[PDB]
Design a protein around this ligand. Structure first.
Ligand SMILES: *Cc1c(COP(=O)(O)O)cnc(C)c1O
Ligand SMILES: *Cc1c(COP(=O)(O)O)cnc(C)c1O
Ligand SMILES: [Mg+2]
Ligand SMILES: [Mg+2]
Lengths: 318, 318
């Protein structure tokens, strides 16, 4: 059937078995990067904005606000443009030129903070700037990605629903990367309605504070956070695997070599994590995962040989 | 259903009506950029290679060759990686860093020519280098994009077939950009089996020699050629519209503003051309077109305000 807008092509993404990469397990990858905006963030962007419009929280006059320099900023910018809404993304000087240019191309405003925190980052500065904008822009809506229940709900109704409709056989392990935890919370909640014994495996960056790891400098965007998200309910997570920038990059390079799938940093994290998991679990297990974004924005990260060598040098004592 | 590889997700791309951009006509856009490799070139890459394997022209030992710095190189690199085939793309020093890096990321070899032709380009040098490689690499297969009948056939069986299956109402105009002409030839051939009165409108770059235009320096990749492709049968084309780099870029910017679709240069060409066409045709006409690739690789072209102003300055007497 024809679509009336690009919004109708959000979701119903392909599911692909990774036969070459995992010859002794049944590993299914949900290709969330094949959403029209280029990442899994199309799901919460569409869902959150449409819910707010339906319930009168967002009208054509409401200005959307979020602190994001990445995939969510791009997805919000696309949905906002389609809906006729103003959007301001709060960013910092570390935003990639590419992401900046894509967000501006969709007509979104960018508010770049300049003052680092005394310890050199921009996290507290960006949190403060969000509140400043909420204070000064009348009629605004804060996407509030780390705390908004509509984030996990979008994933419960989004890939989580499509996963249980496709993978009707028992799901032994569900493996997902984390930043807000909206994906793993929403998808695991849907999965376990049908597959109550599915083990839920969170994959996080080494140095991310989500599960209390000791903070280290992290290069990869997408995976990891510098706060504990309000969305997270730790009791729903059964196993936590941490992966470093080098490990994640090797996983990306291995996936493209073995399966011809060119995916982003957090997908490599997933691959590294699944390789670790299969040293402990039963042969032949059914494992489901999600591949959030494309390799295209990681050409100077993961896919750069010079960057990879620098990351290899970081592995501390190793 | 689950897929066994990424290849199964080639094709069946969305069709979207452009209600905002074309409020007085029924304009349907085939989103070929939503192919897994990021462009319409997934179709000929998959089709040509699979046909050669089926018919014993290509085995696991056959080395694929093509002169391409763009979308076809990326699509071939993906299909070759999946099939376990070696690929060498012949390129020149003008290749974008991004395309170079994507092709290398998929494990393809790159043969960059260095010697310009006496008149400063690399066209004759790249044609010669292809023949050199065919002479020196035993067991090779030249994709031969400008002359290979399998190129147009991929589009006849690809988007052309999906277009007639979806748009069962009379198609008044089919509008497509050209470089090899494989798309417009194959798609128009399928369309006119069902809709014999459909008018076939080619959209080309100003300065492209395909339809004998006077050569000028052209910035946009994707649309236009510096040869008359062997694939082209001119009698099958009913109308030819030429668009310049500025016009094409305005079309891209207008499409993203009106419909939230972030597409590449040749899609903007299509938009400019359809705007010209609707000054002559009947109100309410059904127009079908194709959007070959994403805006992401045009951030320093179309989507750069500084580049756009430079292009505005080129419009000669205008
Ligand atoms: C958002 C995102 C994640 C993590 O998803 P959450 O739902 O925020 O936990 C992982 N990788 C990429 C590339 C992302 O964009
Ligand atoms: C290949 C391509 C075209 C033209 O298609 P042909 O089938 O070669 O005529 C137009 N735009 C883009 C971006 C392309 O990749
Ligand atoms: Mg106001
Ligand atoms: Mg040999």
């Amino acid at each position: 059937a024809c679509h009336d807008s690009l919004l109708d092509s959000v979701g119903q993404t392909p599911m692909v078995q990774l036969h070459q990469l995992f010859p002794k397990h049944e590993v299914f990858a949900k290709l969330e990067y094949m959403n029209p905006g280029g990442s899994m963030k199309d799901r919460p962007a569409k869902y959150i904005i449409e819910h707010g419009i339906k319930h009168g929280l967002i009208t054509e006059n409401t200005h959307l606000i979020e602190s994001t320099s990445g995939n969510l900023g791009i997805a919000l910018a696309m949905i906002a443009k389609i809906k006729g809404l103003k959007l301001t993304c709060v960013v910092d000087p570390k935003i990639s030129p590419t992401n900046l240019k894509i967000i501006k191309s969709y007509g979104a405003n960018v508010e770049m903070v300049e003052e680092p925190d005394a310890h050199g980052g921009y996290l507290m500065t960006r949190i403060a700037k969000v509140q400043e904008l909420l204070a000064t822009i009348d009629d605004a809506y804060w996407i509030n990605q780390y705390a908004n229940e509509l984030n996990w709900q979008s994933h419960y109704h989004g890939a989580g629903t499509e996963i249980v409709e496709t993978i009707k056989q028992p799901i032994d392990y569900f493996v997902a990367p984390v930043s807000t935890t909206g994906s793993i919370m929403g998808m695991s909640r849907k999965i376990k309605e049908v597959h109550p014994n599915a083990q839920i495996v969170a994959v996080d960056a080494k140095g991310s504070v989500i599960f209390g790891d000791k903070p280290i400098n992290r290069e990869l965007p997408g995976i990891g956070a510098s706060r504990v998200p309000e969305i997270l309910n730790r009791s729903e997570i059964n196993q936590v695997i941490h992966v470093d920038d080098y490990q994640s990059a090797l996983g990306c390079r291995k996936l493209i070599d073995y399966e011809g799938i060119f995916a982003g940093g957090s997908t490599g994290s997933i691959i590294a994590a699944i390789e670790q998991l299969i040293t402990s679990i039963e042969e032949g297990a059914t494992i489901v995962t999600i591949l959030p974004d494309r390799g295209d924005r990681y050409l100077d990260l993961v896919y750069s040989d010079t960057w990879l060598e620098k990351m290899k040098s970081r592995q501390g004592v190793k």
